[PDB]
Amino acid sequence: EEKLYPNCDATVWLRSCEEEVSEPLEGTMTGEFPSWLRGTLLRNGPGCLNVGTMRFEHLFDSSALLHRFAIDDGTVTYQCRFLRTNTLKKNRAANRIVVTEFGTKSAMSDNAMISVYPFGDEVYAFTEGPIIHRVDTVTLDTLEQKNMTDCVALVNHTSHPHVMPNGDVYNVGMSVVKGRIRHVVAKFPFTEKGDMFKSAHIVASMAPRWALHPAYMHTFGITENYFVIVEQPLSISVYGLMTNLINNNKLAASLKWYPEYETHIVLLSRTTGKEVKRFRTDTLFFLHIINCYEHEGELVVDLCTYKDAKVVDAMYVHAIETMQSNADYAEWFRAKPKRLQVSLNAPKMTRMKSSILADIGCETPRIHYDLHNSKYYRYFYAISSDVDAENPGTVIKVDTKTGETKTWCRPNCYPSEPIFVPSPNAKDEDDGVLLSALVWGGEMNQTVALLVLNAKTMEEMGRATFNTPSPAPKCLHGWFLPT
Ligand SMILES: [Cl-]
Ligand SMILES: [Fe+2]
């Protein structure tokens, strides 16, 4: 009758928005918002498990729900609107699940629920299939879609492209070249006058370790001189995926875990586009690389690591529903931030040094991205990933130099991925604020807030709180657009 994880309400993930907030909701302000903070926080995430009388069976299948916090002069409004995807249209028309999903068989999907990223002045919602959807940054209307297979011959891609200071976008994905799978880096070059998608081209590539079992990757790294590919022993079975698509099996069965093999860190030259170096580390699974950089002949790769890929199994609806009696659930979610380090001049297949960055589980990490991505940095921000923590909704700041942590948490409160915004006359790396979207657990399922933390102290500066007309689903990733 009793809970193994009494301080954790996993059912914050199991909500369906029943009514869109199309018109801006006025927010109840507490504390003191920074007056200088002006712009739009966009969020994306799962937002509907229901499809007529049917129900999705995995969280990754849940319908993409966009969120908008408009911030100006200490006032904040809230909106949320479903992304108008092909999958949503087809499922709603049929009033049932007619598209095969990651975790659900139909009775490829374009449910771009993972993230939102800027391509110049435009913003696109992503999943890892090749179709992305443009989003109106004011109204959350779904505008045109783009097909990355048509655009640059990507059959799939990560939902976490890298955005350069000059506006250029890089992303990694799979491409079939002369009947063979290759991992490729696509570049979407920014110019005011041009079209980033029209001028998109492949700038690097890499052969998979196993020709018909290419490695899955959710993120990739970039340094001054290299694209960094972390090739983990979780693979997509080409024939498996084809089979499941034909026979209408959930596509998750396409993933294969091979723990007898190690993880490789592969550097592709930004100059030549070819693999130039490769190193080894332990068998691990990862989703989010924190940052990569070169410093005085050393390569640094910071990422949030698991021992295996069981976190995927943890996010089945049934697994979430029954987690309070699951003795292994916390271990499935057991992530640890690690620094992988090696000399750039070291021989090929040298083992990397692997160090823990902090003695606390971290996920959905962010940094002072605009100034520190691909470069030396000191601080990252994340959310606690320990299911069995005293408070599993902790916002964490890690000082990578010292190992010092600073935290913010409140009872029954579940903050999102924190996004860093620098202060107007910023001197230091952590001279700014964190924006986080809050939901609450238990029966407090129709309240959302924008939290603003002081990045130096991790103290709450201010908060805007909203009530939604229907259940408020928990989001995944976002982006801040300054005015
Ligand atoms: Cl607390
Ligand atoms: Fe992600």
Numbering used by the authors: 5 to 111, 132 to 507
Authors' own words:
In contrast to the multiple CCD paralogs found in vertebrates, most insect genomes encode a single CCD known as Neither Inactivation Nor Afterpotential B (NinaB). Later studies demonstrated that NinaB not only cleaves carotenoids symmetrically but also isomerizes one-half of its substrate to form a ~1:1 mixture of 11-cis and all-trans RAL products. This enzyme was thus termed an isomerooxygenase. In NinaB, similar to other oxygenase members of the CCD superfamily, the ferrous iron cofactor activates dioxygen for reaction with a target alkene bond within the substrate.
To bridge this gap in understanding, we report a high-resolution crystal structure of NinaB from the cabbage looper (Trichoplusia ni), revealing the molecular architecture of its active site and details of its membrane-interacting structural elements. The structure was solved by molecular replacement in space group C2, revealing an asymmetric unit composed of eight copies of TnNinaB. TnNinaB adopts the classical seven-bladed β-propeller CCD fold with its iron cofactor coordinated at the propeller axis. The NinaB iron center is coordinated by four conserved His residues and contains an additional solvent molecule bound trans to His184. The iron center abuts an extended pocket, ~30 Å in length, that runs along the top face of the β-propeller forming the substrate-binding cleft of the enzyme. As compared with the apocarotenoid-cleaving enzyme NdCCD, the proximal active site size of NinaB is much larger owing to the need to accommodate passage of a β-ionone or 3-hydroxy-β-ionone ring during substrate binding. Other noteworthy features of the active site include the observation of multiple rotamers for Trp17 and Met339, both located in the distal active site, as well as the presence of 2-methyl-2,4-pentanediol (MPD) derived from the crystallization precipitant, which inhibits TnNinaB activity toward zeaxanthin with an half-maximum inhibitory concentration (IC50) value of 0.67% v/v. In the TnNinaB crystal structure, three of the protomers in the asymmetric unit (chains B, F and H) exhibited well-defined density for the entire region while three others had partially resolved sequences (chains D, E and G). Residues 118–126 form a variable-length α-helical structure with pronounced amphipathicity. In both cases, 11-cis isomer production was nearly abolished despite robust oxygenase activity as evidenced by WT-level formation of the all-trans isomer product. Mapping Trp17, Phe357 and the other residues impacting 11-cis formation within the TnNinaB active site revealed their clustering within the distal region of the active site pocket.
